[PDB]
C-alpha cells in the first residue's frame, strides 16, 4: 500500500473552450410544437397528407411567412421559398379529388440548393441539460399502447422521451420507405405521431414536414439529404447559439391562455438542411430497443434488493414511492426521486444516446467506462492500477470537441467524480 502522496486522484475532464454548442438533432425536441386532431372512435390511420392538412386546419393564425433569424451560412430566400412551395403543393393536393399516399415535389432551384444537388471546439451550453430534463418529464398523453415490465410501462408511457421514440420511429420509417420507393424524387413527408389522451381518445399529431433529397442508398453509409420544417413557439432570439444551423421563419400567431389571460404568441418554423443514412434510418426505426434496454437496467437494479432481502421488492419499490435513488444534483444537495424518476431518467439517457448518436459518443463511452470503473474502485478504497490514466484521459478528451451530448456527459462525469472521491 503506497504512500498517499503517490496515489493518483483522477482530475476533472477538461472540456474545450469555444462558442456555445448548437442543436444537431434530426428533429426538434423540447421546442417542437404539435398541431393535432382527435381521431374518430373507430379511428383507422388516414393518409399522412390528409391528416397533415386536417392538423393544419386546426390552427387559425396562419400568416405570410417572414425570416426572423437567418442561416448564417445559407441562402435564406431559398428557405422561405421552400416553405411557400410546400404550402402551394399542399394547396394542389387539396384541389385534387383524392388525397395521394405520396407527393413528389417540383424540383425547383430552391429545393435543389437546399437538398444540395465540423472539427472546431465548442463550449457546453445550458440548453443541453434543459433538453435532458424535459425528456425526463411526463406528458399528459401516453405514447405507448398495450412481470416487472408492467410497472415499468406505467411509468414511461407518458414520458416525453417516449414521445421521442415514437416520433423517431415514425419519421425514420416514412423516410426509409420514401428512400426505397422514390430515389430520384423530392418527396414531401409529414412528420406525424399518434398518442392517447387522458380522456382515452386517440390523437394524430403533426410536428411539420421533411422534404427528402435524392436517395440512391447503395450502401449503409450513403447519405440522404433532407430539409426539415418544424413548428415551434420558441423565439430563436432567446438562445441564438442553439439555432446556428437553422433558418427560422415566423409563420403564424397563436393564442395561449396564459397566467395573465389570452396572449398572442408568434408561431415559428425551424428550417434546416440535414442528412441521414440507411444505417442511421434503420437505427431510428429500432428506437424501441431503448425501452427494452432501460427495462433491463431497472430489472437489474431490482435484482440487487431481491438477492439482498431474499424476496423481490418490486411491488414495494413501485407501490411505495418512499424509497429513493440519487437522480440529480442541486448544489443545494443531491436530488433524490421515486423509482418512476429513475425509470424515466434512464430511458431519457438511452433515447438521447440514439438521437445524438455519433463517433464522439462511441469513443467517449468506451473510454469513460474504464475511468468510471477506476473511480468506483477508488471510492471503495480498492487500490486499482492507475498507471495508464495518462493514455486514458487522452483517449477520452480527444472525443470532447463540439458534440453537445458528449460535452454534457463529460460535464456529468466531472460532477460524479467530485461526489465520488470527495
Amino acid at each position: 500500500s503506497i504512500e498517499p502522496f503517490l496515489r493518483t486522484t483522477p482530475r476533472p475532464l477538461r472540456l474545450p473552450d469555444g462558442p456555445l454548442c448548437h442543436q444537431r438533432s434530426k428533429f426538434l425536441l423540447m421546442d417542437a410544437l404539435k398541431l393535432s386532431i382527435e381521431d374518430p372512435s373507430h379511428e383507422g390511420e388516414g393518409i399522412p397528407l390528409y391528416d397533415a392538412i386536417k392538423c393544419m386546419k386546426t390552427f387559425f393564425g396562419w400568416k405570410e411567412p417572414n425570416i426572423v433569424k437567418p442561416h448564417e451560412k445559407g441562402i435564406n430566400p431559398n428557405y422561405l421559398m421552400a416553405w411557400k412551395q410546400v404550402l402551394a403543393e399542399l394547396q394542389d393536393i387539396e384541389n385534387e379529388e383524392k388525397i395521394p399516399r405520396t407527393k413528389n415535389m417540383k424540383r425547383t432551384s430552391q429545393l435543389k440548393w437546399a437538398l444540395g444537388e465540423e472539427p472546431e471546439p465548442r463550449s457546453l451550453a445550458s440548453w443541453v441539460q434543459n433538453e435532458f430534463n424535459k425528456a425526463c418529464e411526463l406528458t399528459d398523453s401516453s405514447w405507448i399502447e398495450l412481470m416487472r415490465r408492467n410497472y415499468f410501462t406505467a411509468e414511461v408511457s407518458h414520458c416525453r422521451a417516449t414521445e421521442y421514440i415514437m416520433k423517431g420511429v415514425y419519421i425514420n420509417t416514412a423516410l426509409l420507405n420514401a428512400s426505397c420507393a422514390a430515389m430520384d424524387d423530392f418527396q414531401l413527408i409529414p412528420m406525424i405521431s399518434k398518442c392517447r389522451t387522458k380522456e382515452g381518445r386517440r390523437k394524430t399529431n403533426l410536428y411539420g414536414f421533411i422534404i427528402k433529397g435524392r436517395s440512391h442508398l447503395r450502401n449503409d453509409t450513403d447519405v440522404v439529404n433532407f430539409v426539415s420544417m418544424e413548428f415551434s413557439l420558441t423565439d430563436p432570439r432567446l438562445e441564438p447559439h442553439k439555432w446556428e444551423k437553422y433558418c427560422v421563419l415566423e409563420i403564424g400567431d397563436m393564442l395561449l391562455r396564459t397566467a395573465i389571460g389570452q396572449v398572442s404568441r408568434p408561431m415559428f418554423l425551424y428550417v434546416r438542411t440535414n442528412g441521414t443514412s440507411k444505417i442511421k434510418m434503420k437505427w431510428g426505426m429500432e428506437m424501441r430497443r431503448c425501452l427494452l434496454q432501460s427495462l433491463q437496467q431497472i430489472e437489474s437494479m431490482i435484482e440487487a434488493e431481491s438477492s439482498v432481502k431474499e424476496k423481490d421488492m418490486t411491488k414495494e419499490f413501485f407501490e411505495n414511492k418512499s424509497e429513493t435513488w440519487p437522480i440529480g444534483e442541486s448544489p443545494r444537495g443531491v436530488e433524490e426521486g421515486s423509482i418512476g424518476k429513475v425509470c424515466r431518467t434512464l430511458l431519457a439517457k438511452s433515447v438521447f444516446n440514439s438521437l445524438y448518436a455519433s463517433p464522439q459518443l462511441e469513443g467517449f463511452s468506451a473510454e469513460s467506462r474504464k475511468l468510471l470503473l477506476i473511480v468506483q474502485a477508488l471510492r471503495d478504497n480498492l487500490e486499482p492500477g492507475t498507471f495508464d490514466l495518462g493514455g486514458l484521459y487522452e483517449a477520452i478528451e480527444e472525443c470532447l470537441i463540439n458534440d453537445p451530448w458528449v460535452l454534457l456527459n463529460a460535464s456529468w462525469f466531472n460532477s460524479f467524480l467530485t461526489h465520488a472521491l470527495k
Binding site: 435532458f132 430534463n133 443531491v334 439517457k349
Partner: peptide
C-alpha cells in the same frame, strides 16, 4: 438538473 451518474452513488 437530472444526472444519470448519481445513480452510481446509491
Amino acid at each position: 438538473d437530472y444526472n444519470p451518474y448519481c445513480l452510481y452513488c446509491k
